[PDB]
Ligand binder design. Structure first.
Ligand SMILES: [Cl-]
Ligand SMILES: [Cl-]
Ligand SMILES: [Cl-]
Ligand SMILES: [Cl-]
Ligand SMILES: [Cl-]
Ligand SMILES: [Cl-]
Ligand SMILES: [Cl-]
Lengths: 131, 130
């Protein structure tokens, strides 16, 4: 029912145009893993850099919260991730599952899962497409 | 502490009995595999998804890394492994499974994992389909 503020902040950081708004949420040794793409970042500079890299490749990145729920230091997010890969025929929107581990307000771990096949198919890109 | 429903779900996926998976679900329960894009509703179809998976993949096994419950919601961090029949090599990948429960029954299961990692580990092309 009630969405944790950290979830709202995470979505706003991904939907905005400010890489540091994402990185600042993370611990100094915090990790970020995108399992769909297979990218791994550690620390705020690299994590803010992942928002920057994503924006460089994808226009109009936006993340909306479907629902979220906390169990102790763990937060689960069901979201929709959308955008338009620059140069691709069409945009995409897919469900995503994000698992956070937190310490107070700080994020120590973020894992993102979503269907890369669905992203590419919606986008009109080949199934084996790479940037 | 891992919920018993999580242990049961892993044992169903790791075993050789399709009905052990389906019996865990409500009559109108849903199962979505986002990596492959498959949707099933009801125990017969859900059991059938275990059968279909086993027909395509040898030694399917699911191990629990950690799991947690928030109300009627359970999150599972697991490792999903097996060997796609005919592929050069086996695979093992992390998976995130989101359950919605009612008592012991599962009303919704969503599975997420990297299909690109599955295929790459397996020695299959990136645009490989059955
Ligand atoms: Cl909730
Ligand atoms: Cl909810
Ligand atoms: Cl994924
Ligand atoms: Cl834990
Ligand atoms: Cl826990
Ligand atoms: Cl997925
Ligand atoms: Cl995927």
């Amino acid at each position: 029912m009630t969405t944790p503020e950290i979830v709202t902040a995470w979505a706003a950081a991904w939907t905005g145009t400010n890489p540091n708004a994402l990185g600042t949420l993370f611990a100094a040794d915090g990790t970020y893993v995108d399992h769909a793409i297979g990218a791994t970042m550690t620390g705020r500079e690299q994590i803010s850099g992942w928002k920057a890299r994503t924006d460089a490749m994808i226009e109009n990145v936006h993340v909306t919260i479907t629902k979220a729920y906390r169990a102790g230091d763990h937060v689960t997010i069901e979201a929709v991730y959308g955008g338009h890969i620059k140069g691709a025929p069409t945009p995409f929107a897919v469900p995503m599952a994000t698992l956070l581990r937190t310490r107070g307000e700080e994020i120590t771990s973020d894992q993102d899962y979503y269907s890369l096949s669905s992203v590419l198919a919606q986008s009109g890109l080949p199934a084996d497409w790479t940037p």
